[PDB]
Design a binder for these strands. Structure first.
Lengths: 140, 40, 162, 166, 246
RNA sequence: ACUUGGUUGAUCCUGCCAAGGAAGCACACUUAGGUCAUAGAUUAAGCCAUGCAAGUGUUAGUAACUGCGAAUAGCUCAUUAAUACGCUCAGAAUCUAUUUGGCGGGGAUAGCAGCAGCAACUCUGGUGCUAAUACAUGCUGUUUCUCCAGAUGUGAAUUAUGGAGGAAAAGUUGACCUCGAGGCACGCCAUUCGACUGAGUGACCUAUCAGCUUGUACUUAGGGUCUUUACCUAGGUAGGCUAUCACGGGUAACGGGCGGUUACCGUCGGACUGCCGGAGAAGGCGCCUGAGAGAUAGCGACUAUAUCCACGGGUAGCAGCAGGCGCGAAACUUUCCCACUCGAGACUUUCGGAGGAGGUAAUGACCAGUUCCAUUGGUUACGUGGAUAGGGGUACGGUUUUCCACCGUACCGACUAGCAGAGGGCAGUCUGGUGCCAGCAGCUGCGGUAAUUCCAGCUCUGCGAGUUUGCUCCCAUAUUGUUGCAGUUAAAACGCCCGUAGUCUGAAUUGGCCAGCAAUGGUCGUACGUAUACGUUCACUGUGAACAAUCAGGACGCUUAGAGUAUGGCCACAUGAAUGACUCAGCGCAGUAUGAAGUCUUUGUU
């Protein structure tokens, strides 16, 4: 009931299945590709030069300014905002350095309070922020 | 492993050379050798 | 080539499972929680093999060869007695049975070590042997036949050197 | 070079077929012999597995054969009258297989009196023999074989091709 | 495009030979010969991994080149020469005579034998044809072209072959009620008495019987007609192609 | 074979979003020891300095010539959507060096000797000689055409072979080494490793791709080929493929054995995959030599990069092994070695960046330590009491071609833990600082001066030499539904009727009765064709043939384990290296319950 069940009816079932996959959004997103026209370019981590420092603020109800740097990428020569985690840390980054960017960890989309940006800075100058924030490595 | 044979006639000829130097009895060719093609 | 001997548990922070697994480690004197999970995974390959055999017919060529061969290998290990040697009793067995056959615990039963922990120390420090053969490894699995042959290796126990 | 390969050409369904590889010396064609008449010469050709296809370029004589009497004489080929494939083979007098070419038959005439004076012969052939140019077909492959020979044209065949000439 | 290639790998080497997966990548490529790649067994491998005389492969190529070994009357200094099914192996110095022949399971074994038996060998007819002056002649599973062969010598007949002189003394005819060792496929290395022969239209089947009383078929080309009615013309191994079964 | 937080004042739902488990690239913090495996695929099939990778001498061809090799191995995945690959067949339409078995039958150069020319190269000119298993000579077959017969062989050939004729050189003519034996030719047929041609058939998306195809489809004759064919050129017809998806487009597409995830069904990935087959050498294209090449560490030209120049002219193809530049999130030593495995050769000797071993790396797998046993006092873990290690050090014996490291033996001995959290999903309502600010936070939420979520300390928790963090991906998910979802109102039944492709299609045909535990064997019925086998085939079922590693699985104490194919017996012996699955199609016999086809009738069959 509600489908072909008969012995010879395997063309109807196989071909109808191919149609119904295009309703599913995960098959649709993979196949369209559709991913290339992205700043990340489908790469988890990207690097390049800092343009400057920007204050972008949270939506609602959370009143807070977040401090995300603007970063030009190496490979595309695009520009994109990118969050800087931990308190301080904007002071540690320095102007016009190379940084390694990675994703917000939400497999796309925009994460917390913070709209727009989908990116966090993992390293600066080949060191890593956690080491820097903790202060068991140095910058000149 | 080990094996035993009549006379001295075996290990002179049947054995590999690396056991003879051990018991008691360098890329030069690659370089110096191929000059005999480079020079006639 | 290679294989994955232990598997991680499905859900990390269940209270009953963690509270169970401490008093298997405590009784049998054990390093980590992974040294259980290998013995769980060893019990799986016994029982998954056994159940498939059970599904087959009671006369099939596969069951006669495999069923006799499977019970032969477990009578070695000393889990199945000759009372219980009948194939369905393979689907029983616990990790508490299979942990008991290891060398650590067989020293303790022997009492040479004097403690579950002490037994580990004796084997890890090259004191214990199995028929004139030293066993550094604290998880040997002894085959009942050879359980009798557990004894001091030589060193401090026999040699008496400081 | 000139290829014997067929992958590039369209399927039965009429689909634009695509290469996956270079041309290859399994499937090498070569130029035609184009085997005319006058002055004997031959060019030897190496092939797959060593060997020699002796390609004949221009041939004067040919080892022709009266079938019905069992007799076969080395005979001088004069011209191509007809060929069933192409009229271009007639214009330049090309010897191919199936090539209808007249022959002098001086040897055949000699054979008849040296044997006899049995024999009997047909009434179409005596109307030919007074001229001394028999019709005959090349049955060999001049290019591959390097030698050209054929039987005389006789019987129901000799009616048929005579209308195609006239 | 593929050409005739030298370097045989292990893994790709056949499952007859009982090679280690370890002990290097490459196996010894057989030279071209009478027998095929798949059925045969070289004499590089024969002295390494049966009789166990030559421990290294350097030592194996030594003793063939001293000219102790003799394949089938002749000396053979070439080594890695394919030798497979019913070949005699005379060996010089501490001389022993072998005949190469299948196990129960399909594997090769090696068998010390009496010298009067080890003169001759058997040879199945694969292909029969006429050539040169109306004369019939026969190719074998070796590739010995036995010309001026007698009548009653059709395809799938064995020929006893005297080795010192190039003779064909007997001829064991194909029939029902005749013993036959299978030499290919799943039933390779098995004795059977031939109960039925089933003609196959176009491209035929033959049903067999152990002394135990199992039953099994095969393709006709696989059977090698070993001798007439129970008692064969050959010393058979331990177990005699019966194969265990519990 | 598993659930839990999030729409509400609360409820039960639909429903996703998160959490949660695995691997595979990359980033991070941290690190006693051992064995083993892998490591510039993702982007730039982008570019390359230097060193080296294919050569080859036997007691037996004479530095060269001569003979064979260099078409394999190695690397990479850019083309390729089936022509490749796989799996079945097939050659009666073919070629094949080497092995193996049959059958056979004198003159002219190379090194050597000498005279010269270039900025330069592994280029040479010219003369003066001499070699042969090199080259030419020389005491019935091969090739092709015509005719007459057409086997004891095959499912089948006017095939194999025989005889009678003509032709042609495209030719079999041991003109040969080492001391009676070994070795080497020549030709033809087979054989072997293969090669190459043809057939059937399997699988990634796309209808915002419905018509496509002119040698395109058949036929007759030819050319060409190793052969067959529009492979190509002629004459004659006008055909072929397509809703059972043609044709066109896309691919972040080399195919396959297989790998990851799983209760079953499936599903994603497959450069590599420790193997198989294909393709390519900066981009096309062409060709010689040979059994085999459209070779690329062979040649030729053009193009694009690069470089030298004495300004005339040339020189080079690392997607071989190292190494560098560039590219980027992203990947090691310019070492030692022919001993192991094998390969080339004139060959037990030579050579091999194939291969083997070290060295660097938390990438991956298994193993494993950071102590132990006593008993004094504070509430059984928070100065004593003694023990036992290996990390490490130094010899020597094993080990391997040589180091290292391992495995032993003896002597020295009173520095070894992090990472992540502590509202709920899923261990503090501690004390101190901060006051919708800094900040945390996958999700819900926390912070507005009392913070159980921030920033610190203390205690506690998890997992443990590991542990978080990105993106892709499977499970969770019956949220892709064959098994197996849902459509009155939550998203979801064409506005109705006809209707082709498509899928689906009522009953009926040789049984009853007794012994039953079935296989079967008797009785009731005689329905009386072929003239002891023949009287529909399939699908389906059983059975049989056919068709590496991994997966499952047997044997065996590698000290255990992951692994490996072993190994066990003190008197010369016994073994084992199974089996199943891999699996759809194609092939045989046997069984006919179900489901098909078979069955030209205003009169059919012999």
């Amino acid at each position: 009931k509600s489908k072909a069940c008969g012995r010879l009816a395997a063309r109807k079932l196989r071909l109808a299945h191919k149609s119904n996959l295009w309703a599913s959004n995960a098959y649709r997103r993979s196949l369209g590709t559709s991913i290339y026209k992205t700043p990340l370019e489908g790469t988890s981590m990207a690097s390049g030069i800092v343009v400057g420092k920007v204050a972008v603020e949270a939506k609602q109800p959370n009143s807070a300014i977040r401090k995300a740097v603007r970063v030009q990428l190496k490979k595309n020569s695009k520009v994109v905002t990118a969050f800087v985690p931990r308190d301080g840390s904007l002071r540690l980054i320095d102007d016009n350095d190379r940084v390694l960017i990675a994703g917000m960890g939400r497999s796309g989309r925009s994460v917390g309070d913070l709209p727009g940006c989908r990116f966090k800075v993992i390293k600066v100058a080949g060191f890593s922020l956690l080491a820097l924030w903790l202060g068991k490595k140095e910058k000149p | 492993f080990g094996f035993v044979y009549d006379s001295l006639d075996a290990l002179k000829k049947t054995e590999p050379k690396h056991r003879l130097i051990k018991a008691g009895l360098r890329r030069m060719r690659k370089n110096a050798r191929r000059q005999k093609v480079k020079v006639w | 080539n290679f294989s994955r001997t232990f598997k991680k548990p499905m859900r990390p922070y269940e209270k009953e499972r963690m509270h169970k697994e401490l008093q298997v480690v405590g009784e049998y004197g054990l390093k980590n929680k992974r040294e259980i999970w290998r013995v769980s995974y060893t019990l799986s390959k016994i029982r998954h093999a056994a159940r498939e055999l059970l599904t087959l017919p009671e006369n099939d060529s596969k069951r006669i060869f495999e069923g006799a061969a499977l019970l032969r290998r477990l009578t070695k290990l000393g889990v199945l007695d000759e009372s219980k040697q009948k194939l369905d009793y393979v689907l029983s067995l616990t990790v508490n049975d299979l942990m008991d056959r290891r060398l650590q615990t067989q020293v303790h039963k022997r009492a040479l070590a004097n403690s579950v922990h002490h037994a580990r120390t004796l084997v890890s420090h090259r004191h214990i042997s199995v028929e004139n053969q030293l066993v550094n490894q604290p998880a040997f699995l002894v085959w009942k036949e050879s359980e009798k042959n557990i004894k001091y290796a030589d060193t401090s126990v026999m040699t008496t050197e400081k | 070079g000139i290829t014997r390969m067929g992958d590039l050409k369209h399927t039965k369904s009429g689909a634009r077929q695509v290469a996956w590889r270079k041309k290859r010396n399994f499937l090498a064609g070569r130029p035609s012999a184009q085997t005319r008449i006058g002055e004997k010469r031959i060019h030897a050709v190496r092939v797959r597995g060593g060997n020699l296809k002796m390609r004949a370029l221009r041939l004067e004589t040919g080892t022709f054969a009266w079938a019905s009497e069992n007799c076969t004489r080395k005979t001088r080929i004069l011209n191509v009258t007809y060929h069933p494939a192409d009229n271009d083979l007639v214009r330049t007098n090309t010897l191919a297989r199936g090539s209808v070419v007249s022959i002098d038959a001086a040897p055949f005439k000699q054979w008849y009196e040296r044997q006899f004076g049995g024999g009997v012969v047909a009434p179409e052939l005596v109307a030919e023999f007074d001229q001394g140019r028999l019709l005959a077909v090349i049955t060999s492959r001049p290019g591959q074989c390097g030698r050209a020979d054929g039987y005389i044209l006789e019987g129901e065949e000799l009616a048929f091709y005579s209308d195609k000439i006239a | 495009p593929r050409c005739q290639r030298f370097h045989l790998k292990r893994l790709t080497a056949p499952h007859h030979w009982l090679l280690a997966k370890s002990a290097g990548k490459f196996a010894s490529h057989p030279s071209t010969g009478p027998h095929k790649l798949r059925e045969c067994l070289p004499i590089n491998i024969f002295l390494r991994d049966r009789l166990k005389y030559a421990l290294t492969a350097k030592e194996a190529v030594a003793i063939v080149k001293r000219r102790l070994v003799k394949v089938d009357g002749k000396v053979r200094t070439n080594y890695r020469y394919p030798t497979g099914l019913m070949d005699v192996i005379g060996l010089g110095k501490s001389n022993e005579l072998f005949r190469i022949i299948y196990d129960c399971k399909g594997r090769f074994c090696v068998h010390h034998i009496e010298a009067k038996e080890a003169s001759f060998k058997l040879l199945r007819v694969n292909q029969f044809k006429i050539g040169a002056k109306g004369i019939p002649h026969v190719v074998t599973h070796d590739g010995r072209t036995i010309s001026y062969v007698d009548p009653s010598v059709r395809v799938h007949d064995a020929l006893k072959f005297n080795i010192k002189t190039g003779e064909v003394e007997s001829v064991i005819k194909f029939k029902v009620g005749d013993v036959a060792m299978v030499t290919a496929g799943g039933n390779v290395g098995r004795v059977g008495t031939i109960q039925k022969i089933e003609k196959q239209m176009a491209s035929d089947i033959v049903h067999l019987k152990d002394t135990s009383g199992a039953v099994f078929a095969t393709r006709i080309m696989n059977v090698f007609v070993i001798g007439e009615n129970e008692h064969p013309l050959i010393s058979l191994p331990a177990r005699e192609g019966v194969r265990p079964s519990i």
